[PDB]
Amino acid sequence: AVKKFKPYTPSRRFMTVADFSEITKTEPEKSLVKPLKKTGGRNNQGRITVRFRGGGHKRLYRIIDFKRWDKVGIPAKVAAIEYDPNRSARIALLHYVDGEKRYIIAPDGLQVGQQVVAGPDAPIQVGNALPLRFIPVGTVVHAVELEPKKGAKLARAAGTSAQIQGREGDYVILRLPSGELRKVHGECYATVGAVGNADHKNIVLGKAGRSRWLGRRPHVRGAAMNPVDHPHGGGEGRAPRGRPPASPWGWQTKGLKTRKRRKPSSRFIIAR
Amino acid sequence: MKRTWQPNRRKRAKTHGFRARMRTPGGRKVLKRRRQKGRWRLTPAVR
RNA sequence: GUGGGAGAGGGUGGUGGAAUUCCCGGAGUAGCGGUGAAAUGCGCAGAUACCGGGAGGAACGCCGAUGGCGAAGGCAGCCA
RNA sequence: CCGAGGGUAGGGCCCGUGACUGGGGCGAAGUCGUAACAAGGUAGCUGUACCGGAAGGUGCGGCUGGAUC
RNA sequence: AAAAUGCAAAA
RNA sequence: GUGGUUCGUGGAGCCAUGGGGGAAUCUGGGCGGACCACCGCCUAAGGCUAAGUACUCCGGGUGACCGAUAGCGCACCAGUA
RNA sequence: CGAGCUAGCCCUGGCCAGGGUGAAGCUGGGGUGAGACCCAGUGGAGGCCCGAACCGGUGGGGGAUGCAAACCCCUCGGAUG
RNA sequence: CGAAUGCCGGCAUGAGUAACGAUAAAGAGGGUGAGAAUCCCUCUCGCCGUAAGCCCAAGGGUUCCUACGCAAUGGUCGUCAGCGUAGGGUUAGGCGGGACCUAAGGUGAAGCCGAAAGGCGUAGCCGAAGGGCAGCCGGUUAAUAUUCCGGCCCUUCCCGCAGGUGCGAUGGGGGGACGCUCUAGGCUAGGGGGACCGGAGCCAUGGACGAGCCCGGCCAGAAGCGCAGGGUGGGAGGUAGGCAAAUCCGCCUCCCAACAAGCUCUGCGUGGUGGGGAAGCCCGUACGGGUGACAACCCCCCGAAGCCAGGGAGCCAAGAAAAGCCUCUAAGCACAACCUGCGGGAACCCGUACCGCAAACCGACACAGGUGGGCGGGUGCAAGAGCACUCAGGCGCGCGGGAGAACCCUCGCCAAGGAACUCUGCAAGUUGGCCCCGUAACUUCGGGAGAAGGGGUGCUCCCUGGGGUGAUGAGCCCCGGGGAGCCGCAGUGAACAGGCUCUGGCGACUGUUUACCAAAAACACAGCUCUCUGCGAACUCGUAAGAGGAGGUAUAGGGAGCGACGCUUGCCCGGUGCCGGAAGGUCAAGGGGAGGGGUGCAAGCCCCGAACCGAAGCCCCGGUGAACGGCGGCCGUAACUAUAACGGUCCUAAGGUAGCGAAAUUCCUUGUCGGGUAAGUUCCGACCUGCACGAAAAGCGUAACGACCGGAGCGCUGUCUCGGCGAGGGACCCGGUGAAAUUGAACUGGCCGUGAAGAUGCGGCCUACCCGUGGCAGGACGAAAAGACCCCGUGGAGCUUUACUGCAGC
RNA sequence: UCGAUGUCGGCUCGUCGCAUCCUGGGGCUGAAGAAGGUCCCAAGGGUUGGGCUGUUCGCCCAUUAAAGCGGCACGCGAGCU
Ligand SMILES: [Mg+2]
Ligand SMILES: [Mg+2]
Ligand SMILES: [Mg+2]
Ligand SMILES: [Mg+2]
Ligand SMILES: [Mg+2]
Ligand SMILES: [Mg+2]
Ligand SMILES: [Mg+2]
Ligand SMILES: [Mg+2]
Ligand SMILES: [Mg+2]
Ligand SMILES: [Mg+2]
Ligand SMILES: [Mg+2]
Ligand SMILES: [Mg+2]
Ligand SMILES: [Mg+2]
Ligand SMILES: [Mg+2]
Ligand SMILES: [Mg+2]
Ligand SMILES: [Mg+2]
Ligand SMILES: [Mg+2]
Ligand SMILES: [Mg+2]
Ligand SMILES: [Mg+2]
Ligand SMILES: [Mg+2]
Ligand SMILES: [Mg+2]
Ligand SMILES: [Mg+2]
Ligand SMILES: [Mg+2]
Ligand SMILES: [Mg+2]
Ligand SMILES: [Mg+2]
Ligand SMILES: [Mg+2]
Ligand SMILES: [Mg+2]
Ligand SMILES: [Mg+2]
Ligand SMILES: [Mg+2]
Ligand SMILES: [Mg+2]
Ligand SMILES: [Mg+2]
Ligand SMILES: [Mg+2]
Ligand SMILES: [Mg+2]
Ligand SMILES: [Mg+2]
Ligand SMILES: [Mg+2]
Ligand SMILES: [Mg+2]
Ligand SMILES: [Mg+2]
Ligand SMILES: [Mg+2]
Ligand SMILES: [Mg+2]
Ligand SMILES: [Mg+2]
Ligand SMILES: [Mg+2]
Ligand SMILES: [Mg+2]
Ligand SMILES: [Mg+2]
Ligand SMILES: [Mg+2]
Ligand SMILES: [Mg+2]
Ligand SMILES: [Mg+2]
Ligand SMILES: [Mg+2]
Ligand SMILES: [Mg+2]
Ligand SMILES: [Mg+2]
Ligand SMILES: [Mg+2]
Ligand SMILES: [Mg+2]
Ligand SMILES: [Mg+2]
Ligand SMILES: [Mg+2]
Ligand SMILES: [Mg+2]
Ligand SMILES: [Mg+2]
Ligand SMILES: [Mg+2]
Ligand SMILES: [Mg+2]
Ligand SMILES: [Mg+2]
Ligand SMILES: [Mg+2]
Ligand SMILES: [Mg+2]
Ligand SMILES: [Mg+2]
Ligand SMILES: [Mg+2]
Ligand SMILES: [Mg+2]
Ligand SMILES: [Mg+2]
Ligand SMILES: [Mg+2]
Ligand SMILES: [Mg+2]
Ligand SMILES: [Mg+2]
Ligand SMILES: [Mg+2]
Ligand SMILES: [Mg+2]
Ligand SMILES: [Mg+2]
Ligand SMILES: [Mg+2]
Ligand SMILES: [Mg+2]
Ligand SMILES: [Mg+2]
Ligand SMILES: [Mg+2]
Ligand SMILES: [Mg+2]
Ligand SMILES: [Mg+2]
Ligand SMILES: [Mg+2]
Ligand SMILES: [Mg+2]
Ligand SMILES: [Mg+2]
Ligand SMILES: [Mg+2]
Ligand SMILES: [Mg+2]
Ligand SMILES: [Mg+2]
Ligand SMILES: [Mg+2]
Ligand SMILES: [Mg+2]
Ligand SMILES: [Mg+2]
Ligand SMILES: [Mg+2]
Ligand SMILES: [Mg+2]
Ligand SMILES: [Mg+2]
Ligand SMILES: [Mg+2]
Ligand SMILES: [Mg+2]
Ligand SMILES: [Mg+2]
Ligand SMILES: [Mg+2]
Ligand SMILES: [Mg+2]
Ligand SMILES: [Mg+2]
Ligand SMILES: [Mg+2]
Ligand SMILES: [Mg+2]
Ligand SMILES: [Mg+2]
Ligand SMILES: [Mg+2]
Ligand SMILES: [Mg+2]
Ligand SMILES: [Mg+2]
Ligand SMILES: [Mg+2]
Ligand SMILES: [Mg+2]
Ligand SMILES: [Mg+2]
Ligand SMILES: [Mg+2]
Ligand SMILES: [Mg+2]
Ligand SMILES: [Mg+2]
Ligand SMILES: [Mg+2]
Ligand SMILES: [Mg+2]
Ligand SMILES: [Mg+2]
Ligand SMILES: [Mg+2]
Ligand SMILES: [Mg+2]
Ligand SMILES: [Mg+2]
Ligand SMILES: [Mg+2]
Ligand SMILES: [Mg+2]
Ligand SMILES: [Mg+2]
Ligand SMILES: [Mg+2]
Ligand SMILES: [Mg+2]
Ligand SMILES: [Mg+2]
Ligand SMILES: [Mg+2]
Ligand SMILES: [Mg+2]
Ligand SMILES: [Mg+2]
Ligand SMILES: [Mg+2]
Ligand SMILES: [Mg+2]
Ligand SMILES: [Mg+2]
Ligand SMILES: [Mg+2]
Ligand SMILES: [Mg+2]
Ligand SMILES: [Mg+2]
Ligand SMILES: [Mg+2]
Ligand SMILES: [Mg+2]
Ligand SMILES: [Mg+2]
Ligand SMILES: [Mg+2]
Ligand SMILES: [Mg+2]
Ligand SMILES: [Mg+2]
Ligand SMILES: [Mg+2]
Ligand SMILES: [Mg+2]
Ligand SMILES: [Mg+2]
Ligand SMILES: [Mg+2]
Ligand SMILES: [Mg+2]
Ligand SMILES: [Mg+2]
Ligand SMILES: [Mg+2]
Ligand SMILES: [Mg+2]
Ligand SMILES: [Mg+2]
Ligand SMILES: [Mg+2]
Ligand SMILES: [Mg+2]
Ligand SMILES: [Mg+2]
Ligand SMILES: [Mg+2]
Ligand SMILES: [Mg+2]
Ligand SMILES: [Mg+2]
Ligand SMILES: [Mg+2]
Ligand SMILES: [Mg+2]
Ligand SMILES: [Mg+2]
Ligand SMILES: [Mg+2]
Ligand SMILES: [Mg+2]
Ligand SMILES: [Mg+2]
Ligand SMILES: [Mg+2]
Ligand SMILES: [Mg+2]
Ligand SMILES: [Mg+2]
Ligand SMILES: [Mg+2]
Ligand SMILES: [Mg+2]
Ligand SMILES: [Mg+2]
Ligand SMILES: [Mg+2]
Ligand SMILES: [Mg+2]
Ligand SMILES: [Mg+2]
Ligand SMILES: [Mg+2]
Ligand SMILES: [Mg+2]
Ligand SMILES: [Mg+2]
Ligand SMILES: [Mg+2]
Ligand SMILES: [Mg+2]
Ligand SMILES: [Mg+2]
Ligand SMILES: [Mg+2]
Ligand SMILES: [Mg+2]
Ligand SMILES: [Mg+2]
Ligand SMILES: [Mg+2]
Ligand SMILES: [Mg+2]
Ligand SMILES: [Mg+2]
Ligand SMILES: [Mg+2]
Ligand SMILES: [Mg+2]
Ligand SMILES: [Mg+2]
Ligand SMILES: [Mg+2]
Ligand SMILES: [Mg+2]
Ligand SMILES: [Mg+2]
Ligand SMILES: [Mg+2]
Ligand SMILES: [Mg+2]
Ligand SMILES: [Mg+2]
Ligand SMILES: [Mg+2]
Ligand SMILES: [Mg+2]
Ligand SMILES: [Mg+2]
Ligand SMILES: [Mg+2]
Ligand SMILES: [Mg+2]
Ligand SMILES: [Mg+2]
Ligand SMILES: [Mg+2]
Ligand SMILES: [Mg+2]
Ligand SMILES: [Mg+2]
Ligand SMILES: [Mg+2]
Ligand SMILES: [Mg+2]
Ligand SMILES: [Mg+2]
Ligand SMILES: [Mg+2]
Ligand SMILES: [Mg+2]
Ligand SMILES: [Mg+2]
Ligand SMILES: [Mg+2]
Ligand SMILES: [Mg+2]
Ligand SMILES: [Mg+2]
Ligand SMILES: [Mg+2]
Ligand SMILES: [Mg+2]
Ligand SMILES: [Mg+2]
Ligand SMILES: [Mg+2]
Ligand SMILES: [Mg+2]
Ligand SMILES: [Mg+2]
Ligand SMILES: [Mg+2]
Ligand SMILES: [Mg+2]
Ligand SMILES: [Mg+2]
Ligand SMILES: [Mg+2]
Ligand SMILES: [Mg+2]
Ligand SMILES: [Mg+2]
Ligand SMILES: [Mg+2]
Ligand SMILES: [Mg+2]
Ligand SMILES: [Mg+2]
Ligand SMILES: [Mg+2]
Ligand SMILES: [Mg+2]
Ligand SMILES: [Mg+2]
Ligand SMILES: [Mg+2]
Ligand SMILES: [Mg+2]
Ligand SMILES: [Mg+2]
Ligand SMILES: [Mg+2]
Ligand SMILES: [Mg+2]
Ligand SMILES: [Mg+2]
Ligand SMILES: [Mg+2]
Ligand SMILES: [Mg+2]
Ligand SMILES: [Mg+2]
Ligand SMILES: [Mg+2]
Ligand SMILES: [Mg+2]
Ligand SMILES: [Mg+2]
Ligand SMILES: [Mg+2]
Ligand SMILES: [Mg+2]
Ligand SMILES: [Mg+2]
Ligand SMILES: [Mg+2]
Ligand SMILES: [Mg+2]
Ligand SMILES: [Mg+2]
Ligand SMILES: [Mg+2]
Ligand SMILES: [Mg+2]
Ligand SMILES: [Mg+2]
């Protein structure tokens, strides 16, 4: 896990690369792929709406299955475990006995040659998707729908999971990857286990260029701007923040809480 | 020194061409003005 | 070698109940804490003492011994 | 040809010496406190960690070279 | 289970 | 809540209306500068209507208008080179 | 009216003589209870080295109604990112 | 009109002045002509040659070829020309583009939004240097040619016959189809060699009739065949997926080849045939043609980055689409239709000259600047696209002739000294490639390293190793090893070609930047911390719709600081900020109406209007430091002094820990002490009195790195003592062409005075024939720019905030 | 003098003043001699090379007959740095 390097150049000394042994064969890709339109940070006007983006390696989008219920009761063999350049996780190719091929984000511990299935039936086992209400309290679980039949929105990133803390009526209580305690509806599909590829957080980019490949252009401190540009611009040498620290748009960036208050989903939250 | 004028023909009609002026009310008035002054060319050359 | 033995010897995975803490609810007041005596502290924004629900971490009461096991360090709820 | 030695360069060990600095020994009656020896007035010692003018204090674990009416 | 520091040098 | 009018919130009516509430059909309703009474004026919430008015691309007439650095930017193949 | 200059991004193509260093892995031998590990060969990594094209513009001299409204010489930085 | 640095125009002055645009370079003979350094031809000489040659693309638009021309354009000249006049010249089913495809992006029925203008938007459509698609070699013109002609070779469409088959699509499926680095096998291009083959002709000047010298020894070509490669399993059973249906594709089970065996497709070779074909000699030219010839047309060698091509391996950052093409079925239709073979006919539009690293494009110019792809030969140097010379081909840069001053620029050398030069070794120099020996602190174990510092280097002869191709051989290539010797000052004999070491500061590193005075210690950077954000996320853009975020989901995303790594980051929550708090205080519209008023006979109409309930906010209560920030004073005290571990006391929210410290910070200051030097305001090490260091606007270090800034040494130097000589391009002279700012008018001297205080111009005196040339810069408060500094102006504009007042946003 | 009179220091080239640093000539001396002290006359010539620092100045090293002080827009940037 996490290949390291001898320092034969600087920046190779700190560099650390993911472990790809977990990847079954398939370097190449099932034509479940689809081209990615790269934005460059720019919105439909010609405009940067998210700074510092672009450059970075070309990517082919693997379409993946975030509703497992369209296929209730049809099992599938796990054919391949492969690299998805579009997410922190690895994806599983699974061949349904339907004959249909689909991508799943690959849970931790699911192996090639495995039997996988989704539905209220289902064994409680890695890879299976059930509605929440049928999953035994206290099992960790990932790929979770927030509302029924709208697709899996939670715990998708490498090594994330969520745990079932209990039930109340139509709804069940989850602990999310954040630590937030949330009511999710009983009917929402989740898929048991945890996302895996969890050494992911331990990679170390190691050189500037490697950050570039990931499409991330240099990030410059307001501190180094002039005041046309930022609240922290100015002042002869260096100088401190000189006001409570702010964004370029001037709102406060240390502690100041930005979630809408009167939001409806407040009723379904209990936590941090 | 690379200078400022780097003529390419497609750009030119693509940009100041007749069909391009008529797209935009900004440009349709350009044409209106240009015509009213009696210009011999309402739109740069061609080709 | 063969047949038996005792054991907290070690490794791994699970699991139980007591208590502390915090949160929710309920009832419920004018104090609680704490000490040599006190103050700081907590409490009318409803504390402490009481019941119910939940979360979580650690340590395993009685058995228990001046007993056992291990080369030493050391090892103690239960189960494989 | 080799050749005493001279010359140019680069290392090794050792001895002396250096502004300053670190602690150590010693020095009849200096200053600050009381850490230890009597539960030494917080039993002491101890490995380690942090802290503190100083002796030391405190945490964790350990030893009896301490403790029962 | 304890308020409370010290005591010139030599014989 | 605003705009219009001479009206800049003023005692601020009239006329228009973005929001909220919301009638009546002549014994009905609007106005005469907050409001009330009295005396008057007028008929909202559909539409059309020549002429008298504005202008000068164009044609003519005329000038105590210019006369080629003037007069139009151009008297001349000028909105050109 | 402008991104035919310049700035960034997006799509699609092209370019980088030659030489140097020799990571991981693999293979073999040693080693061990098994390991770590050591050596040899192989191997061919790298915002790795030298240096053209290409991209720069370090220091100096020249130019200064210039060859030039930023140039020329010598020198110098990068050159698989 | 006399002034406005006025406006338009004309003509002056500087002035026959500077310059005439790369220092690659010229000389002569002949020709033409009114006229010739400048046009033509010849001979000689010089310059490019990974170009300064040749071919494409842009862009330009007749510049192209030719005849006639010289007023202007041409930096001179002109008989010439890219110039004036006229006439010619661009030929395609196969090359490029379009009657093909899709990319970003554009546009856009549907739909959504916006006062109007308009903004979005799925499908679709448009969009190419990508995908797809059928032509190769010669000859011919003054000027076009894959375009005409010559030969050989293909494509689609239409009609027709023959044979085959459930035919059939805009729909399903396959495929198209993809990275980067490194690459294997075989070919080709290309190149060198040959004693072999073909060839006009040569023997000079001492020698050579020679296995002499000189020239050439190929190009294209269907089927077939050969060699090398690419792609590909075959049959059945079941089938619920691929948004209808499929016999296709997917999936499951059987069975059989695992192999190109086959089937298939490219590349190369060979191929009926077609065609090229040198030197030299003679004509014949602005250049082209005849002979050479019936030309020869072969063997060996080196060899791609190109081809086989969807080849292989490794790696992580994980590498277009759509059509063409195949396949499957649907309606339909199965007299259709489609597939295959053959045959006849049919095949449109636009481009096509010329320049194209430039005198034809971008730079006002026939401008030393900029401009994308391809080819880019030979020898030698380790290699190479480097460097020197050179083929092919192209040039001598559109003013010349002289002279041989100062001075300038670019170069060469130098006695002795060797940084004394100077802010500084700035500049130059030294060093320089390769092979071998050797190589320190320190280190993150990689490095530091080309550390340092040395030795070798040519040529001849002899002996000998291994490889490639051949054959297990010869020849040809390729690496080497060993012995003997020859020459010079010198063998990387010319050209390309590091000076080294010690030591501080800053920044970890490679990168980035003020186009055009700053490349840095600034910015970025990996990485650390805080913070926001549960997903119709936060955040950004937009009035909105919409979008970005993201087809992502807390191992994610946004904001902020810090800036590899190591060891660390202390105390203050009073103020500000954010965070938390159901109470309380305050509070707007609104609610509610005590009670008062206008007015009417009155029913009433109409006004005020206290209580009380009333949100955020503020207040109040806590928390919070990798949030804004802040981290004391006076006095005493030890064996002699000295100092103060110690104490007293005032204040604070708390009084600066560690570690650093005369520092990128130290005023006094060249602090004091040490080191270095003969001498050191700098530098290094110390001390601490820190004017005014101190822990993420981080503290202290750190190997490696640096065109960064400091200090020292060695080496070497014209940097210097201190200059000298020489070279070339100018400066000077002659012929040609001929500017510029500036300019009140000038008949324009020195001193001492004077004067608006610095006088050619006023006074006094002195000195002084008229006019130029080449030179130097003291003065004309010389030129230039209506001072940038300073002020003034109730003049501007960028920026800030707890200035005022608004607005968006929330 | 702001419709411009470029500012320190250096280098280069000087020129002048004398309140003389040296050399020449003198008086007084608490001048034995040598060597000094102090004043007078004298502008003819001369007045070193280095370390530090941008420095002027100053300090220091090594010398010297001496290591003079001023002015010339703190002389001199259409002379340089
Ligand atoms: Mg747009
Ligand atoms: Mg980032
Ligand atoms: Mg940054
Ligand atoms: Mg800045
Ligand atoms: Mg801006
Ligand atoms: Mg701002
Ligand atoms: Mg600031
Ligand atoms: Mg600034
Ligand atoms: Mg500052
Ligand atoms: Mg700043
Ligand atoms: Mg949160
Ligand atoms: Mg222009
Ligand atoms: Mg174009
Ligand atoms: Mg209460
Ligand atoms: Mg409670
Ligand atoms: Mg010897
Ligand atoms: Mg010796
Ligand atoms: Mg000592
Ligand atoms: Mg004790
Ligand atoms: Mg004690
Ligand atoms: Mg004790
Ligand atoms: Mg303590
Ligand atoms: Mg203990
Ligand atoms: Mg023990
Ligand atoms: Mg005492
Ligand atoms: Mg109103
Ligand atoms: Mg109004
Ligand atoms: Mg009004
Ligand atoms: Mg008013
Ligand atoms: Mg009004
Ligand atoms: Mg209304
Ligand atoms: Mg009406
Ligand atoms: Mg009318
Ligand atoms: Mg009128
Ligand atoms: Mg008229
Ligand atoms: Mg007249
Ligand atoms: Mg006229
Ligand atoms: Mg006129
Ligand atoms: Mg006239
Ligand atoms: Mg007119
Ligand atoms: Mg006019
Ligand atoms: Mg006209
Ligand atoms: Mg651009
Ligand atoms: Mg590319
Ligand atoms: Mg290489
Ligand atoms: Mg190895
Ligand atoms: Mg590199
Ligand atoms: Mg480098
Ligand atoms: Mg270099
Ligand atoms: Mg070159
Ligand atoms: Mg090239
Ligand atoms: Mg460029
Ligand atoms: Mg740049
Ligand atoms: Mg330069
Ligand atoms: Mg620069
Ligand atoms: Mg210069
Ligand atoms: Mg210069
Ligand atoms: Mg170089
Ligand atoms: Mg270079
Ligand atoms: Mg380099
Ligand atoms: Mg790249
Ligand atoms: Mg005038
Ligand atoms: Mg006048
Ligand atoms: Mg002027
Ligand atoms: Mg003037
Ligand atoms: Mg002349
Ligand atoms: Mg003159
Ligand atoms: Mg002259
Ligand atoms: Mg001249
Ligand atoms: Mg010329
Ligand atoms: Mg010339
Ligand atoms: Mg003649
Ligand atoms: Mg001639
Ligand atoms: Mg000539
Ligand atoms: Mg060549
Ligand atoms: Mg040509
Ligand atoms: Mg063209
Ligand atoms: Mg042109
Ligand atoms: Mg032609
Ligand atoms: Mg011509
Ligand atoms: Mg002619
Ligand atoms: Mg002429
Ligand atoms: Mg002429
Ligand atoms: Mg010219
Ligand atoms: Mg012509
Ligand atoms: Mg044909
Ligand atoms: Mg057609
Ligand atoms: Mg098209
Ligand atoms: Mg299309
Ligand atoms: Mg649109
Ligand atoms: Mg519509
Ligand atoms: Mg679209
Ligand atoms: Mg195309
Ligand atoms: Mg194409
Ligand atoms: Mg074609
Ligand atoms: Mg031609
Ligand atoms: Mg041809
Ligand atoms: Mg033909
Ligand atoms: Mg059928
Ligand atoms: Mg069919
Ligand atoms: Mg088809
Ligand atoms: Mg078809
Ligand atoms: Mg398809
Ligand atoms: Mg497809
Ligand atoms: Mg691959
Ligand atoms: Mg060939
Ligand atoms: Mg060949
Ligand atoms: Mg040959
Ligand atoms: Mg030959
Ligand atoms: Mg022969
Ligand atoms: Mg013959
Ligand atoms: Mg002879
Ligand atoms: Mg052939
Ligand atoms: Mg099969
Ligand atoms: Mg079947
Ligand atoms: Mg089947
Ligand atoms: Mg189906
Ligand atoms: Mg063939
Ligand atoms: Mg023939
Ligand atoms: Mg492949
Ligand atoms: Mg491949
Ligand atoms: Mg289509
Ligand atoms: Mg049918
Ligand atoms: Mg068929
Ligand atoms: Mg045919
Ligand atoms: Mg043509
Ligand atoms: Mg052509
Ligand atoms: Mg050409
Ligand atoms: Mg060029
Ligand atoms: Mg080119
Ligand atoms: Mg040309
Ligand atoms: Mg050319
Ligand atoms: Mg030309
Ligand atoms: Mg032109
Ligand atoms: Mg020229
Ligand atoms: Mg040019
Ligand atoms: Mg030009
Ligand atoms: Mg270029
Ligand atoms: Mg080549
Ligand atoms: Mg060559
Ligand atoms: Mg060669
Ligand atoms: Mg040689
Ligand atoms: Mg070489
Ligand atoms: Mg090449
Ligand atoms: Mg060359
Ligand atoms: Mg030639
Ligand atoms: Mg010589
Ligand atoms: Mg010399
Ligand atoms: Mg010498
Ligand atoms: Mg020397
Ligand atoms: Mg010096
Ligand atoms: Mg000096
Ligand atoms: Mg220095
Ligand atoms: Mg230098
Ligand atoms: Mg050099
Ligand atoms: Mg050393
Ligand atoms: Mg090494
Ligand atoms: Mg070093
Ligand atoms: Mg060396
Ligand atoms: Mg070194
Ligand atoms: Mg030799
Ligand atoms: Mg020789
Ligand atoms: Mg020798
Ligand atoms: Mg050489
Ligand atoms: Mg070098
Ligand atoms: Mg230091
Ligand atoms: Mg740096
Ligand atoms: Mg650092
Ligand atoms: Mg910067
Ligand atoms: Mg710059
Ligand atoms: Mg500029
Ligand atoms: Mg600038
Ligand atoms: Mg740099
Ligand atoms: Mg908004
Ligand atoms: Mg939206
Ligand atoms: Mg979105
Ligand atoms: Mg998306
Ligand atoms: Mg974050
Ligand atoms: Mg920073
Ligand atoms: Mg505070
Ligand atoms: Mg607080
Ligand atoms: Mg606070
Ligand atoms: Mg609050
Ligand atoms: Mg309240
Ligand atoms: Mg109220
Ligand atoms: Mg009310
Ligand atoms: Mg009344
Ligand atoms: Mg409130
Ligand atoms: Mg508080
Ligand atoms: Mg802190
Ligand atoms: Mg404060
Ligand atoms: Mg105190
Ligand atoms: Mg006091
Ligand atoms: Mg300290
Ligand atoms: Mg220290
Ligand atoms: Mg200090
Ligand atoms: Mg300081
Ligand atoms: Mg000393
Ligand atoms: Mg010293
Ligand atoms: Mg220091
Ligand atoms: Mg600081
Ligand atoms: Mg600071
Ligand atoms: Mg500070
Ligand atoms: Mg701080
Ligand atoms: Mg820093
Ligand atoms: Mg530091
Ligand atoms: Mg750099
Ligand atoms: Mg640098
Ligand atoms: Mg010199
Ligand atoms: Mg000379
Ligand atoms: Mg000369
Ligand atoms: Mg006179
Ligand atoms: Mg005067
Ligand atoms: Mg006079
Ligand atoms: Mg006079
Ligand atoms: Mg003169
Ligand atoms: Mg002068
Ligand atoms: Mg002057
Ligand atoms: Mg002024
Ligand atoms: Mg004022
Ligand atoms: Mg103002
Ligand atoms: Mg003046
Ligand atoms: Mg002034
Ligand atoms: Mg003036
Ligand atoms: Mg002036
Ligand atoms: Mg005198
Ligand atoms: Mg004297
Ligand atoms: Mg005397
Ligand atoms: Mg006496
Ligand atoms: Mg005497
Ligand atoms: Mg005496
Ligand atoms: Mg004198
Ligand atoms: Mg003098
Ligand atoms: Mg020195
Ligand atoms: Mg210095
Ligand atoms: Mg001084
Ligand atoms: Mg001196
Ligand atoms: Mg003087
Ligand atoms: Mg001066
Ligand atoms: Mg100057
Ligand atoms: Mg000066």
Numbering used by the authors:
A (entry chain 11): 2 to 273
B (entry chain P8): 1 to 47
Question: What do the study's own words say?
Answer:
Here we present several high-resolution structures of Thermus thermophilus 70S ribosomes programmed by templates carrying missense errors. The collection of our structures puts forward a decoding mechanism that, for the first time, sets the molecular basis behind the phenomenon of translational infidelity and is in good agreement with in vivo studies of the missense errors that occur during protein synthesis. Our models suggest an advanced mechanism of decoding that, for the first time, describes how a missense error can skip discrimination, leading to translational infidelity. Our data provide evidence that steric complementarity and shape acceptance but not the number of hydrogen bonds between the decoding centre and a codon–anticodon duplex play the discriminatory role during decoding.
We have successfully solved the structure of the 70S ribosome in two post-incorporation states. Another messenger RNA (mRNA) construct and tRNATyr let us model the second G·U mismatch with the cysteine codon UGC and the anticodon QUA bound in the P-site. The structures of both states revealed the remarkable finding that a G·U mismatch mimics a canonical Watson–Crick pair at either of the first two positions of the codon–anticodon duplex. Further analysis showed that the codon–anticodon duplexes containing G·U mismatches have an overall geometry that is identical to that of the corresponding cognate duplexes consisting of standard Watson–Crick pairs. Although the 3 Å resolution of our models is not sufficient to distinguish between the two tautomeric forms, the observed Watson–Crick-like geometries for the G·U pairs can be rationalized by the presence of enol tautomers in the P-site. For the second codon–anticodon position, a bend caused by a wobble G·U pair would be also forbidden because the tight shape of the codon–anticodon mini-helix is defined by the tRNA anticodon rigid structure and a tertiary structure of tRNA stabilized by the ribosome. Our present structure with the P-site G·U mismatches trapped in a Watson–Crick geometry, as well as the previous report on the A-site with G·U in Watson–Crick-like geometries, fully support these observations.
